[PDB]
Every structure is written in C-alpha cells, then in structure tokens.
Structure 1
Amino acid sequence: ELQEKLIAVNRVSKTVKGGRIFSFTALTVVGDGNGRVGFGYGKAREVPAAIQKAMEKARRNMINVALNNGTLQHPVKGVHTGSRVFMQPASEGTGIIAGGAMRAVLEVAGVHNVLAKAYGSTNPINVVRATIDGLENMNSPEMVAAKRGK
C-alpha cells in the first residue's frame, strides 16, 4: 500500500570556476498509511529526478509505530540540532492543526489527528527529521501492565 509525499522542492545555486551552476533539490516522505514512514532528501539535474532520489532515501529506512485511535499512544519529543518537535495526542477525532513539515510525515503513516508543534529553527528538513526522531520516541502498547492507567 505504498504512498509518497513531496513536502518541499526548490532550486539551488553553487559556485564553480568564474561563475555559477543551478540544480534541483527535494524533501520527501514515504509510508504505508498504517504504521510506518521513512524520510528522504535528494539533489539532481532535472526536478523529477531530484524528487526520485529523495524517494529512494525515504525507502532506505522506515520507522514503524503502533498508532492508537489514529493518533499517538502517548506524548512524544523529537530533536534534530536546533529543531525541537513535541506532540500531544488528540481527542474527539479533531485537532489537525500542525504545518506540513510535521503533518505530512504523519498523514503518510495513517495519523488522522495530532497536536504537533515545532520549536526553535524552522528549516523543514530538520523539522521533518525531528518529527522522525519523535516517531523513534514513541513506544508500543498497552501490554506491559505496569501502571494502573489511565
């Protein structure tokens, strides 16, 4: 059930001998709509080929989580450099909310409502990979029974 999302795509400029050269770069995520997402970055000549190089990175590793009520099992924190992400679980099917640099990473994994926020610097690659670090921060079940609840 493979699904892909483009988050951002732009051109870049670079210095060479006595001048400059232009190229394309993309930021993407890929997931299964039910438990996993992977993140990709990529640069190339021609824009579709840059996007495709990012999709191949998003397939190089995926993070697999146990989503609960189409939302988070518990609150989570994710960090990459200056970009800090925090997420509170959402109630009543509503609460979405959050910009594409958080939302796109979760709408590809099967999340329907989530109260995500980003803090610090807003480079979207760092925010997306901090959202992925927050998905490495979530735990699985509802099995260990060590707390009364809830």
Structure 2
Amino acid sequence: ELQEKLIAVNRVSKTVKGGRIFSFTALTVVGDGNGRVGFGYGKAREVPAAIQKAMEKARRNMINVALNNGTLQHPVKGVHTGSRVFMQPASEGTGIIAGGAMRAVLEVAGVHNVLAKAYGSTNPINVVRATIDGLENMNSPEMVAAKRGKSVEEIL
C-alpha cells in the first residue's frame, strides 16, 4: 500500500569516441502516508527500468517522521547543497501549499496541512534531499520531554 511518486526524469549523456550515449535518471519518492518516507534515484539506459530501480531504492532507506494529525510539530528549514527548504505547520484543512518536489515528498509522507517554500536552487534532487532531512529533524514533544527529563505537559 506504499504510495509511490515519480517526480523527475532527466536524460543525461556521456560522450564516447564513437558517439555520445544517453541514459535516463529517474528521481522518485515513496511513502506510506503515515510518517515513513524514502526517496530513490536510479539510472538506466531507458526510462522504465530507471524508474523501477529508483522506486526499488526508495523502498529501502525509508526514514521515520514524527508528525501529528497530518501536519508538522514545528517550523523546519532543511538545507542541502544549493537548495534551502522551509516548511511550517498549517491549520486544519489548508492542504499542501508547496512546490511540486516538496509537495510530492510531503503528500507521500502523509502530512495534510503545511506551508513550504524552496529558496535557492530548485534542482529536484537537492530539494528532496533537503526536505527529507528536514523532516527527519523534527522533534516530537515526548522526544523533547525524554531528552530533557521532563513531562510532556510541562513543555506545554
């Protein structure tokens, strides 16, 4: 029942003495819509096998995300390479207000209401890396309670 999502398919090339050969790189994302999400990036001589192996890799490396009620617990700004992502929890029923890469990652992770912006490069690979690590850096209230030796309602 893992939701998959293709988000980028580029055709790269490499020159050889006889001719320049071409390959296709597929960047896809996968997520159970319940706080687990990974991403995959595959290369193949032709697009279907590329997306296939990309989704296969994405099936591994699925990280956990400590969301609550289909939204974040606090604003997050992940930065990867030249791309910086900013995500912020939103009220109920606002939806996913984000760029296509960020929207794919988020909706496949299961968040339902969030506001996102992508500053810097919008290169989808770096964008998804940034947002995925940023999601991995969220902190649930009970996590903070644990690492601070307090009760959760004490933090609230």
Normalised by the length of structure 2, the TM-score is 0.86
Distance 1:144 1:79 in 2: 22
Distance 1:87 1:149 in 2: 28
Mark the runs of 5 or more structure 1 residues left unpaired by the alignment.
none
Is the CA contact (8 Å cut-off) linking 1:38 and 1:61 kept in structure 2?
Answer: yes
Residue 24 of structure 1, CA deviation: 1.2
- Deviation string 1:62-83 (CA, Å, 9 cap, x unpaired) is 1111221211011112111111
RMSD over aligned CA atoms reads 2.7
Is the CA contact (8 Å cut-off) linking 1:66 and 1:141 kept in structure 2?
Answer: no
Residue 90 of structure 1, CA deviation: 0.5
Is the CA contact (8 Å cut-off) linking 2:5 and 2:104 kept in structure 1?
Answer: yes
Q: How many residues get paired?
A: 150
Is the CA contact (8 Å cut-off) linking 1:65 and 1:140 kept in structure 2?
Answer: no
Distance 2:7 2:92 in 1: 27
Distance 2:142 2:40 in 1: 31
Residue 125 of structure 1, CA deviation: 0.4
Aligned-partner SS, 1:77: coil
Is the CA contact (8 Å cut-off) linking 2:29 and 2:104 kept in structure 1?
Answer: yes
Judging by fraction of residues, say which structure has more helix.
2
Aligned-partner SS, 2:30: strand
Is the CA contact (8 Å cut-off) linking 2:11 and 2:23 kept in structure 1?
Answer: yes
Q: Which residue number in structure 2 is paired with residue 103 of structure 1?
A: 103
Indicate the percent of aligned positions where both proteins have the same amino acid. Answer: 100
Q: Which residue number in structure 2 is paired with residue 55 of structure 1?
A: 55
Is the CA contact (8 Å cut-off) linking 1:105 and 1:128 kept in structure 2?
Answer: yes
Query: Which is worse superposed, 17-26 or 121-130?
Result: 17-26
Is the CA contact (8 Å cut-off) linking 1:63 and 1:135 kept in structure 2?
Answer: no
Distance 2:49 2:66 in 1: 33
Q: List 4+ stretches of structure 1 deviating above 4 A.
A: 142-150
Distance 2:129 2:11 in 1: 21
Indicate how the Cα distance of structure 1 residues 82 and 34 shifts in structure 2: closer, same or farther if over 3 A, else same: same
Is the CA contact (8 Å cut-off) linking 1:26 and 1:43 kept in structure 2?
Answer: yes
- Deviation string 1:82-132 (CA, Å, 9 cap, x unpaired) is 111111101132043111110100111111111011111111100011001
Residue 148 of structure 1, CA deviation: 14
Distance 1:12 1:111 in 2: 33
Normalised by the length of structure 1, the TM-score is 0.90
Is the CA contact (8 Å cut-off) linking 1:70 and 1:113 kept in structure 2?
Answer: yes
Distance 2:97 2:91 in 1: 13
Is the CA contact (8 Å cut-off) linking 1:77 and 1:137 kept in structure 2?
Answer: no
Distance 1:122 1:4 in 2: 21
